[PDB]
Amino acid sequence: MVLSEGEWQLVLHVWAKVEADVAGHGQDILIRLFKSHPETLEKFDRFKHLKTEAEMKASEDLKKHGVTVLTALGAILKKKGHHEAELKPLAQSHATKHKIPIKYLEFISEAIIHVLHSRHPGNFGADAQGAMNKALELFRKDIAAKYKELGYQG
Ligand code: HEM
Ligand SMILES: [Cl-]
Ligand SMILES: [Cl-]
């Protein structure tokens, strides 16, 4: 699909709040992902030893990865649909090395939306959540298209 400039601004206005503390947002989002869909944690050989929420919260390496993930996602969002360059290496690594299905990308999208809804009601009302959903749908659509080009089922 194609987002309007108005929709991109709702996206960027809540992302500006995320950037006050991306490490804290990253922790919340990965922990939510793992709690709501435990099967996703099994894709991280580096983190699947983390047994509880408390262990996850105290993991500096998990925190580090959350900052890496949200900073990569933020760079894609800021391109406002012109994100082919950002998507190529991400798609290749997640298709061929990590083996991450599109359904799992849907799971983390859900986790992102849940955490933004929880932390930022002032910037994440119905219209803004709609715009974020649209942006994440666009991201997943384009990743899916790359997966097909790369030979991966998704
Ligand atoms: C918003 C969606 C996501 C973004 C932007 C993202 C971004 C990244 C980035 C930038 C890296 C490091 C560079 C690389 O290997 O490509 C990475 C690594 C990785 N990601 Fe993703 N990721 C996303 C979703 C997921 C999901 C849903 C899973 C699986 C449940 C996943 C599993 C992994 C794994 C296993 C690694 C290697 C981690 C390690 O052992 O160091 N990612 N991701
Ligand atoms: Cl600001
Ligand atoms: Cl901390």
UniProtKB/Swiss-Prot annotation:
A Pfam family reported for this protein in Swiss-Prot or TrEMBL: Globin
InterPro entries: Globin, Globin-like_sf, Myoglobin
Catalytic reaction(s) noted: Fe(III)-heme b-[protein] + nitric oxide + H2O = Fe(II)-heme b-[protein] + nitrite + 2 H(+); H2O2 + AH2 = A + 2 H2O
Phosphoserine: residues carrying this PTM: 4
Keyword Transmembrane helix: no
Sequence ranges assigned to domain Globin in this UniProt record: 2-148
Keywords: Cytoplasm, Heme, Iron, Metal-binding, Muscle protein, Oxidoreductase, Oxygen transport, Phosphoprotein, Transport
Binding locations of nitrite: 65
Record-listed heme b binding positions: 94
Binding sites annotated in the UniProt record for O2: 65
Coiled-coil regions listed: none
Gene3D superfamilies reported for this sequence: 6.10.140.2100, 6.10.140.2110
Main location: cytoplasm
Phosphothreonine sites (modified residues): 68
A GO CC term assigned to this protein in UniProt: extracellular exosome
Subunit structure: Monomeric.
Protein name (database record): Myoglobin
Lineage, highest ranks first: Eukaryota, Metazoa, Chordata, Craniata, Vertebrata
